[PDB]
Symmetry: D2
């Protein structure tokens, strides 16, 4: 009833994301993997785990890539969700533009989730590609940014033990400074000022901590696989009508905020985004910080939009 | 409550093992990670997932491996379950007997699980390692053999669709040909003779199939991580008195069978192996397969204990 | 999107069944409750639980009963599953008449629905429902089941009590549903079965547990908390198979075409998007179980004829 | 591991409360059912359900009740949580609550008491007086179940803000019909309006009479408090084993804080019971008038029940 495709499934992120998706997909679904190198090896590895009721499809790659690769054209028949996770800005921009053109040509009513690293710039890029073809729904393009909310939630639960909250709202952007946590809109007696400042700074520059631990080897591969798999399950469950979750995602604001591509709460549904909620009441400190984030996001959209 | 340690966690197989454990461990547990290189990087990677109730520790290795190191001893204090997944025959046998020596000197009352490649050979080596120390409980040494059950369940499920079974018994050994799937002891009308031979053969050489598709660049890693993590849930959940599961494993056989280290069903409890069950009824074809399998397993055991 | 209706929700078992169903139904499901008296209370009592995504409807019955109740006809539009648990030396007659009328009223507007029978004289009431559906003109032999999970629950509990740390998830039970017809197949389960002369006592206990419970109640009532646990599980299995989210294997008092000579035995089946899709053979049994089976079948044969003669 | 005793298990609320507790209790625990009439019928009814790892005990009552029932003295040995459910009004119900706490606390002075008897405003302080005569009284181990309001509040708001859904709604005050004050300003998302929040906040305060009206004066919400009572008990047992630290709203005793000694306020459960008492938090002007009035009514109920003990 649902078909989920992963683009770039033989990488570090794609391998772990694929394993978690297999263990949680509903009965009777189907998977689909694609990569230039390593797809056959990964495909005949998940076919041995029992997981009754799940079928795995497979499409091999090609010697150094050519535009509009023929193999991907037959893999994209009848696909409902595309998880575009491929890359290692200039090099990554071309890869995103190449893939969306091939995938959207066969299936034009599907949903897209962007997981490539500079989400601020590749999300608007994908909007231009769908405009040239002539098919574009603003309610079916989402940029995954749930990783920051996972870091904000963890950092507050370890400071107010044994008081535990499920989630924390985060708005703004998703790169380095455009992330702003709204710690005031959660139940409980917030710890103190001049300590929320240290916690708020940690969430923004938490990425550089992981790459420093690896001594410049890699990045936080395991974190985004968990964050990507959680968000992907939200879309499919809402697609079948088994949920109406309220999540935070980098979406296109139809009016609303002056910035056209802010990261604001939404309500998912059968047809995609269903409701766009206002940010809500915020304090003075979170007001000055938010106004600085919107300015930086403005340039990021334009720079990404210069390419395409 | 319960402390779980994964030795050799920065490898390709052990990285997916740790991620799966963090999402299933009970509230208030602990996770310990150790490897020679790359331990801190994995450590400050899972610490960012929220997962309230779980703490994470780690210990870093050093220059090319030396004998028993202080870093491994400090992490091993008060550890209930040890998962040994580390390696690259003689190269792996030397590594395994070193970690068990250093781990068992600080927590002799723990449960040891073996994940490394020569299962029929590394498991008796660890038992001979513990005897030399002075402490060895035959109910607290298990060799993981759940991958064969996962393969045999999938292959038989594809053939009898839409009939689904939760598990399939597998006895014998682990290497290539000692694996004997007992398809007669499952509920249902088995498809047909002269077809089960191919299915039983596919399970025997399923490992070689993955390496060929990888162009001889590696082996299965995503499938072995799932089996290793699933088995550790049974041991931990039973230790804290929340279940008593019946599993198949490559365990010691005191009395019972003639082979000193056959793989047979057991029942797990608050002290480890508490009840060993007989293999049960079999047919003629499976009896012949088990007769040849026993001969190779006996020879495999002797070679490992010699080392 | 699935519609599940519980007929007789204000009785002793209907209330617990409805409460158990409310917490397990899938998102977007709808629950209907009908009874002659007491339906509004159950309705605007269950509606105050959170249960996001589930709507609760109801239709109150009437005065001393009348045939073809107009409220039931209106409530039966757009229904997928019918869960029929409604009833009070002549206990059989009242229940048979009630079931006949209820099936006649419910199937006249939704012929493509599943019927589940939970009224106690199962062996005689299931062929009554089949014959009524035949009389109407619509009858699907893969969409008519009789719940028989209570005996399996009892057998599993007893055999797990016998063997201390060795647990099994289920136990095959074939035959019928009365006290002489239940026959557990203890040979087709893993492990070293305890001993002879200890299994006969267990089988007798499985057969007489109902009278044990009734007598323990000082002759005042019957088993209601246990009977409501089985119906909820069977209904969950049916709805999840119908929606396409599973294909499980169950034991139920279903029809058989061909196979056994007895028209309405209880054998393992596999459920699918169209109800039953594959009936399986009973399997290999030992000699002691064989002797029970031929005696079990004889009583079931005479049970079926009474129900058919009633119509 | 954990022994849970349900007092009054053969009643309308107790029977359904026991059925839900059998399906959700952790492996390795034990149930204990007691009542004056009908205990044997219920006890040998839940033992047929397999649920491997659970043992069901039983203890019959007596003739028309006598003080200090001997049968209730052996069952009280080893219990870890007591769920007082027996009931029929204030004069009759106060005698029953006073008798059972006296017998149970004399054998198991280190257990948790979860009062579910109907006059929660008046019966909770009564049990405090009973425990003081014996000489053992822990204020962190005595709680009153008032979770049926949060269930009613969440369902009513979620039916008007579709498709926006919240998991819980904070409710404080008391528990009868005027002492309930829901705090609808403390939830995420844009609140609907005014002059409609007034009708919603009022319905939560008069919902009990609506259930009785539908029954034509035959009963009350038996199924609702069974679900509410069973869900609340699971929080306490899990926090005793150390498997959770939930934050819940309950009618507890405050060691200072509010001037009213028995307000309903948020708390944090732990290994020893209540581990933290949290401030109510910011509220709006409209809800400020309701809360100030509610405290005045609550004060009478505490003193009305605390003088019956003498």
């Amino acid at each position: 009833m649902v078909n989920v495709a992963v683009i770039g499934a033989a990488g570090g992120i794609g391998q772990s994301l694929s394993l978690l998706l297999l263990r949680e997909l509903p009965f009777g679904s189907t998977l689909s993997l694609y990569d230039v190198v390593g797809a056959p090896g990964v495909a005949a590895d998940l076919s041995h785990i029992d997981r009754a009721g799940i079928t795995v499809k497979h499409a091999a790659g090609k010697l150094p890539p050519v535009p509009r690769d023929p193999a991907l054209t037959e893999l994209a028949e009848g696909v409902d969700v595309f998880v575009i996770v491929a890359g290692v800005f200039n090099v990554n921009a071309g890869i995103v533009m190449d893939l969306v053109l091939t995938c959207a040509s066969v299936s034009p009513n599907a949903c897209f989730c962007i997981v490539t690293n500079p989400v601020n710039s590749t999300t608007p890029i994908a909007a231009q590609t769908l405009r040239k073809i002539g098919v574009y729904n603003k309610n079916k393009l989402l940029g995954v940014s749930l990783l920051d909310g996972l870091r904000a939630t963890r950092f507050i639960n370890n400071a107010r033990h044994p008081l535990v909250v499920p989630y924390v709202p985060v708005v703004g952007g998703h790169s380095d400074v455009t992330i702003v946590p709204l710690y005031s809109q959660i139940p409980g007696p917030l710890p103190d000022e001049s300590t929320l400042k240290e916690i708020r700074k940690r969430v923004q520059v938490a990425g550089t901590e992981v790459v420093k631990a690896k001594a410049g080897r890699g990045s936080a591969t395991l974190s985004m696989a968990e964050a990507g798999a959680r968000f992907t399950m939200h879309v499919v469950k809402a697609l079948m009508g088994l949920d109406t979750p309220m999540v935070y995602a980098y979406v296109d604001t139809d009016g609303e905020h002056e910035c056209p591509f802010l990261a604001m709460p939404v309500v998912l549904g059968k047809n995609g985004i269903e409701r766009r909620l206002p940010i809500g009441p915020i304090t003075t400190v979170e007001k000055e910080m938010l106004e600085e984030a919107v300015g930086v996001v403005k340039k990021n959209i334009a720079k990404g939009e210069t390419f395409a």
